[PDB]
Design a protein around this ligand. Structure first.
Ligand SMILES: Nc1ncnc2c(CN3C[C@H](CSc4cnccn4)[C@@H](O)C3)c[nH]c12
Ligand SMILES: Nc1ncnc2c(CN3C[C@H](CSc4cnccn4)[C@@H](O)C3)c[nH]c12
Lengths: 229, 229
């Protein structure tokens, strides 16, 4: 077995795992709670980071450095950009960018800063494992690019602009930051999102309606990956 | 003595300290280099994080968790909002917000997410120590609010809007994120910025001209604080 981090942003994205696991302990650290449970031969560490890039960066860092995570699976919801994605559909990120990281005034591409790249990649072995699990459970699973930033996108123009620049299939507020931390600390990273809305007009209303259910779809899937790991 | 972290974003903000310290060792970690030196009775850990909120969050996390920092001083440059600030002037942050953290579609104020606050405070003892050092060296030192986000601000409208919303005296891309990490990990934090530009039209040109010198002004000051610690 191994130490597996399971990370989400909101309580809704992680509580379904805690209710399935039943027996777990808690540690208060980094102004948050981290949850610990056995599952098969593995030792799980779970948390919801709170929303956004800074919060998620800190949690990923803590789970690896303090709690010894050897793999990190991210589970949660996202806003769909690709028109073929429907609410509830699962998307794993092959790579991710920060659409709101902007020193373009100095001639750099949007999302780029010196020492880093525009896209951060997820782990190929974990991605292939997800494809196997999807086949076994007869679940539709799409591969794609996720654009991350610290804004809830609910505007057709913004949606279109970010989709065009990064060829992004969905948006959210934690993926690129988590994948960056994992890459930096040499930990294999998997980023899974279930669609809660289509990031346009009324996206906030669709989010409210579908978040609880979409969060469970993603959460169930990452736990099924822990079985195969 | 104690373990003191000195953190900047860019090489220009930290290399002046390395040239003064002369004798230091290096460790490659978290896709970056961290520098280690004795100074008086203290053990220093230094680094430039690379630009932005995610990079700075990760470095602060690493310096505390992995390298045992008991205090963290941030040194660097910033864009002036307060009209009384001139290029080269020093500003320490009493508190900081993320101006680009936005779930306003759900009714929340700009900069607010659940579980967190709009402003993060710096450490009062370190701030008072800075005021003493400023008096001793006959250096003009202003206290103020810093607005942090992942954009280089070089636009009068954006400058004015961020200044108005947060009552911000300057802007930069790392302060709020660093101060948040330090608070979360119970480490006293000090954030010092020397002005490199006025965040308006041509801010990119003023930055290029004044970054090296303004960075030295800030860097000299934090090293003087390490003498009194
Ligand atoms: N269109 C979109 N744009 C940006 N992100 C998303 C997401 C995914 N999550 C939801 C949540 C912000 S909404 C939130 C709602 N209520 C309370 C707190 N946060 C953040 O963790 C990112 C789903 N759809 C998105
Ligand atoms: N007006 C302003 N807006 C936002 N931030 C600032 C800063 C402070 N720094 C400079 C740098 C972006 S410029 C940069 C240029 N070349 C390479 C990397 N970064 C980032 O670390 C924040 C000074 N003035 C600012």
């Amino acid at each position: 077995g191994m130490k597996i981090a399971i990370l989400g942003a909101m309580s809704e994205e992680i509580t379904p795992l805690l209710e399935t696991l039943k027996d777990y302990t808690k540690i208060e650290h980094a102004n948050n709670t981290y949850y610990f449970a056995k599952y098969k031969d593995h030792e799980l560490v779970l948390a919801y980071s709170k929303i956004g890039k800074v919060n998620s960066t800190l949690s990923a860092s803590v789970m690896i450095e303090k709690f010894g995570a050897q793999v990190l699976l991210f589970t949660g919801v996202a806003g769909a950009f690709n028109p073929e994605l429907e609410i509830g559909d699962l998307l794993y990120a092959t790579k991710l960018a920060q659409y709101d990281l902007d020193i373009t005034a100095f001639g750099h591409p949007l999302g780029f800063v010196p020492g880093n790249e525009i896209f951060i990649k997820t782990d190929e072995k974990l991605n292939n494992l997800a494809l196997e699990v999807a086949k076994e459970l007869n679940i539709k699973l799409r591969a794609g690019i996720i654009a991350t930033g610290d804004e809830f996108i609910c505007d057709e123009a913004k949606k279109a602009k970010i989709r065009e620049i990064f060829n992004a299939d969905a948006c959210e507020m934690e993926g690129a930051s988590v994948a960056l931390v994992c890459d930096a600390l040499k930990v294999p990273c998997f980023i899974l999102r279930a669609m809660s809305d289509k990031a346009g007009e009324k996206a906030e209303f669709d989010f409210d309606e579908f978040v609880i259910n979409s969060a469970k779809i993603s959460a169930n899937f990452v736990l099924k990956m822990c079985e195969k790991l």
